[PDB]
Amino acid sequence: MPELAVQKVVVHPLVLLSVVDHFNRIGKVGNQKRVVGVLLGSWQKKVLDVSNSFAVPFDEDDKDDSVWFLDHDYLENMYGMFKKVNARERIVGWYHTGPKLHKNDIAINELMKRYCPNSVLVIIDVKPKDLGLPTEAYISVEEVHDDGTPTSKTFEHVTSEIGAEEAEEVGVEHLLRDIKDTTVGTLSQRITNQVHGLKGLNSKLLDIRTYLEKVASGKLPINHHIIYQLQDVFNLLPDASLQEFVKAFYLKTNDQ
Amino acid sequence: MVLESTMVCVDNSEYMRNGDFLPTRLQAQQDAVNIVCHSKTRSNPENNVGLITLANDCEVLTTLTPDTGRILSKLHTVQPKGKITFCTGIRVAHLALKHRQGKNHKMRIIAFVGSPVEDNEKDLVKLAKRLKKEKVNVDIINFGEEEVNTEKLTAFVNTLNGKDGTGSHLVTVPPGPSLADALISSPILAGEGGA
Amino acid sequence: MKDVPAFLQQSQSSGPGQAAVWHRLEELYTKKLWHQLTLQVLDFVQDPCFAQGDGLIKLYENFISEFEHRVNPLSLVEIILHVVRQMTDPNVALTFLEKTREKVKSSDEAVILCKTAIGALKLNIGDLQATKETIEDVEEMLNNLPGVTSVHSRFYDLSSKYYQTIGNHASYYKDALRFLGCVDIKDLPVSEQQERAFTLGLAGLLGEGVFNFGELLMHPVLESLRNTDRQWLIDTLYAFNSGDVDRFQTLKSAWGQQPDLAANEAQLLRKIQLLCLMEMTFTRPANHRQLTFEEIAKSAKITVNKVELLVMKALSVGLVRGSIDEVDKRVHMTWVQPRVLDLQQIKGMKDRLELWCTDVKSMELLVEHQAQDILT
Amino acid sequence: LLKLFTTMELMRWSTLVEDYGVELRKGSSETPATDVFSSTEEGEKRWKDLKNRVVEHNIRIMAKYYTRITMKRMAQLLDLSVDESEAFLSNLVVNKTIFAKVDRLAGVINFQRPKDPNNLLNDWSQKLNSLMSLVNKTTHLIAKEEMIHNLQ
């Protein structure tokens, strides 16, 4: 069923908000367990705009993979109900509540395809963290493996962005004790962006690095992708070079 | 029963295609699963049944509803892949049982056996302590371990009995021509404390 | 229904050990244990009748028809497979296999399995177009379902045989690896496995493509199974890498064995030269970009005006990237390929990566220090 | 004939003419020797063009793949002398079949634009940007591989 029809994923402030609330609302079922909900939104659009979410009961084991409970009833009743109000909004998929992508996810996804016309895996890293965004988008891709069995189900990442309607943005400001954070703006913001970029880069490099130690000893697989990426850094050898300055600024204040 | 949430676990095995029950085991079990559901509805309209499959990896087919229809449609389909995956069937059921649309009812598992139960004594005994603590009983209908196998199941069923007023039952159904319904031997149509 | 027990009963009294398999089958059919009866037929064909006896096929025709709903779709295929091996003529076996196939309740892959068995026969006859076609269709069908264990294992080994016979190195290398993940023993002798290791190890030497030398060691197929033919192979894998046209011209017996090499003798003495480039460039390029071209030509042991030619071809495909500068007679390598599944390389990248991490932290304190008022 | 030109490898006219001479001229079409357009007698008028084409193609592939090669090495492949090549170079560049600059010394062919500060500048930015795109992508794959079902 459609997961391949999404290149780009945009999320309203609402969805990020809604998920944290659902976690408590189910009767405070967590810890090892997670809480899932439906995502309602668009599809047959290259841009996926997830409009809303509403709570669903769920018990997850992510240390096993031969047990999970997923409420069947909620998905169906909710898809049938919703058409009258909005004919475009259908069940877009489900959010996973961190900490990162699992292979544990393919299994839960499969069921969601059957029930729901669409599914998508949006992973919201746990309870509120970070200044920027904590959502990543994944679409389940079917690939051949040239060493195992063709038709394996795995997750490939797709670009995650945000975006929302006018009325909703206006709501955020009212509630909130500021407006938004950094991504680029004023003279101050660009420099912050630079510092934000360094702490961010550093996190990506730790993932690779901890993995290599684990592959070398502890025998995690050797994949061509990991090795390809590392080699390039040494090869390209960037060389510092001239340019990009200007002196104009003083004349303008003098004139004024 | 009156105010019980029940999960029927469906067995779909390479021993369900069998013709020990005349004309076919598939059909004979199909009449049994429908009866169990029609009886509970007739008993209390507030009673609900749910569906999970024992066989293969876990799929939650339906959460709690009155429908006989869901359990019928599944039965027609056969699974050569997976038979009785008992340990797991109990675990999904316990979890599933908790969320209910007939809230604050008793917790019951009916599993149909109809294949030799692969699981040894160490799994079985372990499962009984989890059942006591959550206070859910499991009922076995045993035509699956008289057919070419010794019944492991009895000790477990006996111990499980009397944890509440809707205790466990060992319902005895022969292996040879006698159908999957001989429900007369021990209650399961609705709950009872005895064995 | 019981046309078939009447015939078994008669037969039951004869056969030295076949008597026993017959007794069990009758007892189970009456009980109407359909699962148990199907499982007895399987055992029945393999040791008894149609090897120790004769007329299993005839008995089988009767047996599948009526009993069809008591036997499962996957299994029906398995029983027929064993007899077909035993059949002396592939022609009469092909006739049976097509007609016999059926499907009832408990729907399965049975059509597809029965197809693999037919493809195997086409190889026996030895008409290459015919075998190529059966392999393509059946592969497609098998590949879509992930469910395939046993069928994939026998089929990939059958295809493996066809690719070395035709004499194409690339086809064999891709095929072999799939066989390694899906492996099982249904009726896979020790002999077949050894042929597979030896051909695979050789395949990497024959091409003019990718360097497969490091990875070959890692792969369980060669590593687990040994003989003196393959003892020769291990030395040969790093004889082209150093550049020696001697450590394979006396271990040259390996190629003679396989028919795989059958136009990849015109690719054997091209590969050597690419390999001489691959070794030096891998180590020295990385840290500092340029390397001399003079060492690589001499290791090749083939002239300067023809080593450039293969090296240009390597830049073109993208196996390696960079330039040949003949103004100084050196090779400037922009990028080098990292040979895959080598344990040593993982260690090498790790220590480098830690140095980068430091660098980020060091720099970050400075950027914030100035323009801190502006940053807030 | 198709396979040689499609694969970018350095070649020369001297070998190319002799070999193809036996194949093309002999080649049965519907059934006869005749096919023209560089095969038989009529075909010879078209054939002349084929030589010129090999020399435009050799200079092109070397231009794209390498950044510097000497003029002496280049001549051996093209089957020209330096004086003959130099004339041909003046007209090629004007049509824009290739971009190449050759000298009288036969020290070098610069297939790049001469070492001016802008090319060095351009490359330095591109190298930086590619790394950052790649480090992000790998972390996403890695995260699934690690954690998995949490059976390991």
How far apart are alpha carbons C83 and C93 in whole angstroms?
8
SS3 of C301, please? coil
Residue A223 CB contacts under 8 Å (≥ 6 apart), including other chains:
D141, D145
D142, A226 in Cβ contact below 8 A? yes
How far apart are alpha carbons A184 and A177 in whole angstroms?
20
C36, C28 in Cβ contact below 8 A? yes
The pair of structure tokens assigned to C194 is 């050894």
Chain C residues whose CB is inside 8 A of the A210 CB are none
How far apart are alpha carbons A222 and C342 in whole angstroms?
8
- Beta strands A121-124 and A90-96 are parallel
A157, A138 in Cβ contact below 8 A? yes
How far apart are alpha carbons D63 and B158 in whole angstroms?
87
Q: Any CB–CB contact under 8 A between B11 and chain C?
A: no
The candidate with the shortest Cα–Cα distance to D134, out of A213, A236, C314, C215, is A236
Interface test with C, best of A193, A227, A232 (most C CBs within 10 A): A227
The pair of structure tokens assigned to C136 is 């393509």
Neighbours of C328 (CB within 10 A): 13
Tell if the CB–CB gap between C323 and D66 is shorter than 8 Å: yes
Neighbours of A28 (CB within 10 A): 10
The pair of structure tokens assigned to B28 is 């004979």
How far apart are alpha carbons B127 and B88 in whole angstroms?
10
Residue A171 CB contacts under 8 Å (≥ 6 apart), including other chains:
none
Q: How far is CA A194 from the centre of its chain?
A: 22
The pair of structure tokens assigned to A241 is 């070079």
How far apart are alpha carbons A112 and A117 in whole angstroms?
8
Chains D and B touch (3+ CB pairs under 8 A): no
CA distances from B47 to B4, B36, C263, D51 (A): 6, 12, 76, 91
- Beta strands D101-102 and B170-172 are unpaired
C264, C212 in Cβ contact below 8 A? no
Q: Any CB–CB contact under 8 A between A190 and chain C?
A: no
Residue C266 CB contacts under 8 Å (≥ 6 apart), including other chains:
none
The pair of structure tokens assigned to A12 is 């309203």
The pair of structure tokens assigned to A118 is 């669409």
Residue with tokens 């591109």: D126
Q: Any CB–CB contact under 8 A between B19 and chain C?
A: yes
Read off the DSSP letter of residue C69: G
Q: Which helix (H) or strand (E) holds A235?
A: helix A224-236
Residue with tokens 């997830």: A50
The pair of structure tokens assigned to A226 is 């990991």
Q: How many CA atoms lie within 13 A of D101 on its CB side?
A: 6
How far apart are alpha carbons A95 and A39 in whole angstroms?
8
- Beta strands A47-55 and A58-59 are unpaired
How far apart are alpha carbons C214 and C209 in whole angstroms?
14
**Residue C116 phi/psi, 5° resolution?**
-60, -40
Q: How many residues does chain C have?
A: 376
The pair of structure tokens assigned to C143 is 């590949």
Tell if the CB–CB gap between A236 and D130 is shorter than 8 Å: yes
How far apart are alpha carbons C110 and A163 in whole angstroms?
51
End-to-end CA distance of chain C: 89
Interface test with D, best of A139, A204, A244 (most D CBs within 10 A): A204
C69, C106 in Cβ contact below 8 A? no
SS3 of A8, please? strand
The pair of structure tokens assigned to C286 is 């990385």
Residue C344 CB contacts under 8 Å (≥ 6 apart), including other chains:
none
> What letter represents residue B89's amino acid?
G
Q: How far is CA A131 from the centre of its chain?
A: 15
Q: Which helix (H) or strand (E) holds C59?
A: helix C56-67
**Is the Cα dihedral A15, A17, A20, A25 positive or negative?**
negative
How far apart are alpha carbons A170 and D40 in whole angstroms?
80
User: Taking CA D9 as the corner, what is the angle to CA D4 and CA D14, rounded to the nearest 5 degrees?
Assistant: 65
Chain A residues whose CB is inside 8 A of the C285 CB are 235
The pair of structure tokens assigned to C156 is 């990939």
DSSP for chain D, written as a single string: -HHHHHS-----HHHHHHHHHHHHHH--SSSSS---SSSSTTHHHHHHHHHHHHHHHHHHHHHHH-SEE-HHHHHHHHT--HHHHHHHHHHHHHHTS---EE-SS-S-EE-SPPS-HHHHHHHHHHHHHHHHHHHHHHHHHHHHHHHTTS--
Instruction: Give 3-state DSSP helix, strand, coil % of chain C, rounded to 5.
Output: 70, 5, 30
Residue C288 CB contacts under 8 Å (≥ 6 apart), including other chains:
none
Read off the DSSP letter of residue C155: H
B9, B109 in Cβ contact below 8 A? yes
Q: Which helix (H) or strand (E) holds A156?
A: strand A152-158
A-D contacts (CB, under 8 Å): 90
Chain C residues whose CB is inside 8 A of the D72 CB are 326
Residue with tokens 């007895």: C40
D59-63: long-range contacts, CB 8 A cutoff, minimum separation 24: D59/D92, D59/D98, D59/D100, D60/D97, D60/D98, D61/C312, D61/C316, D61/D8, D61/D9, D61/D10, D62/C312, D62/D10, D62/D109, D62/D111, D63/D98, D63/D99, D63/D100, D63/D111
Crossing angle of helices C56-67 and C73-86, rounded to 10°: 170
Tell if the CB–CB gap between C33 and B17 is shorter than 8 Å: no
B144, B118 in Cβ contact below 8 A? no
The pair of structure tokens assigned to C102 is 């059926």
Quickly count helices (H) and strands (E) in chain A: 7, 9
- Beta strands B48-53 and B60-65 are antiparallel
A-B contacts (CB, under 8 Å): 38
Chain C residues whose CB is inside 8 A of the A209 CB are 350, 353-354, 357
User: Taking CA C4 as the corner, what is the angle to CA C2 and CA C8, rounded to the nearest 5 degrees?
Assistant: 125
The pair of structure tokens assigned to D69 is 């090669």
A122, A137 in Cβ contact below 8 A? yes
Crossing angle of helices A72-82 and A105-115, rounded to 10°: 40
Residue with tokens 């009748």: C49
How far apart are alpha carbons C90 and C104 in whole angstroms?
28
The candidate with the shortest Cα–Cα distance to D55, out of D83, D69, D74, D70, is D74
> What letter represents residue C68's amino acid?
E
Gap from B195 CA to chain C (nearest CA, Å): 30
Chain C residues whose CB is inside 8 A of the B176 CB are 31
- β-strand partners of B138: B109
Neighbours of C307 (CB within 10 A): 22
The candidate with the shortest Cα–Cα distance to A89, out of A45, A146, A125, is A45
Chains in touch with C (3+ beta-carbon pairs under 8 Å) read A, B, D
How far apart are alpha carbons C34 and C28 in whole angstroms?
7
Tell if the CB–CB gap between C360 and A150 is shorter than 8 Å: no
Q: How far is CA B20 from the centre of its chain?
A: 20
SS3 of A126, please? coil
Q: Which helix (H) or strand (E) holds A204?
A: helix A187-216
**Is the Cα dihedral C25, C26, C29, C32 positive or negative?**
negative
| Cβ-count burial D28-41 (b if 16+ within 10 Å, e if not) | eeeeeeebeebbbe
The pair of structure tokens assigned to C147 is 């469910």
How far apart are alpha carbons A230 and D135 in whole angstroms?
9
CA distances from A101 to A63, A199, A212 (A): 13, 21, 19
Q: How many CA atoms lie within 13 A of A191 on its CB side?
A: 15
Q: Any CB–CB contact under 8 A between B86 and chain C?
A: no
B134, B107 in Cβ contact below 8 A? yes
How far apart are alpha carbons C312 and C323 in whole angstroms?
8
- Beta strands A69-70 and A58-59 are antiparallel
How far apart are alpha carbons A14 and C369 in whole angstroms?
37
**Residue C41 phi/psi, 5° resolution?**
-65, -35
Gap from B193 CA to chain C (nearest CA, Å): 35
Gap from A244 CA to chain C (nearest CA, Å): 18
Residue with tokens 């091996």: C85
Residue with tokens 């059926």: C102
The candidate with the shortest Cα–Cα distance to B61, out of B24, B10, B23, B19, is B10
B145, B151 in Cβ contact below 8 A? yes
Kindly identify which residue of chain C lies nearest to residue B79, measuring between CA atoms: C106
The pair of structure tokens assigned to A248 is 């104009």
Interface test with C, best of B17, B75, B78 (most C CBs within 10 A): B17
B50, B64 in Cβ contact below 8 A? yes
B141, B39 in Cβ contact below 8 A? no
Kindly identify which residue of chain D lies nearest to residue A107, measuring between CA atoms: D149
**Is the Cα dihedral D29, D30, D32, D38 positive or negative?**
negative
DSSP for C95-120, written as a single string: HHHHHH----SS--SHHHHHHHHHHH
Neighbours of A180 (CB within 10 A): 13
Q: Any CB–CB contact under 8 A between B75 and chain A?
A: no
Gap from A127 CA to chain D (nearest CA, Å): 19
Read off the DSSP letter of residue C68: G
CA distances from B53 to A226, B7, C338, C357, D146 (A): 40, 10, 48, 50, 30
The candidate with the shortest Cα–Cα distance to B92, out of B74, B117, B111, is B111
Tell if the CB–CB gap between D147 and A100 is shorter than 8 Å: yes
Exposed, middle or buried by CB within 10 Å (0-12, 13-18, 19+), for C100?
middle
Tell if the CB–CB gap between D7 and C327 is shorter than 8 Å: no
Gap from C182 CA to chain A (nearest CA, Å): 6
CA distances from C93 to C73, C88, C134, C222, C316 (A): 19, 9, 16, 34, 50
How far apart are alpha carbons B51 and D20 in whole angstroms?
74
Give chain B as a 3 state SS string: CCCEEEEEEECCCCCCCCCCCCCCHHHHHHHHHHHHHHHHHHHCCCCEEEEEECCCCCCEEEEEECCCHHHHHHHHCCCCCCCCCHHHHHHHHHHHHCCCCCCCCEEEEEEECCCCCCCCHHHHHHHHHHHHHHCCEEEEEECCCCCCCCCCCHHHHHHHCCCCCCCCCEEECCCCCCCCCCHHHCCCCCCCCCC
Gap from A51 CA to chain D (nearest CA, Å): 25
How far apart are alpha carbons B107 and B94 in whole angstroms?
8
Chain A residues whose CB is inside 8 A of the B66 CB are none
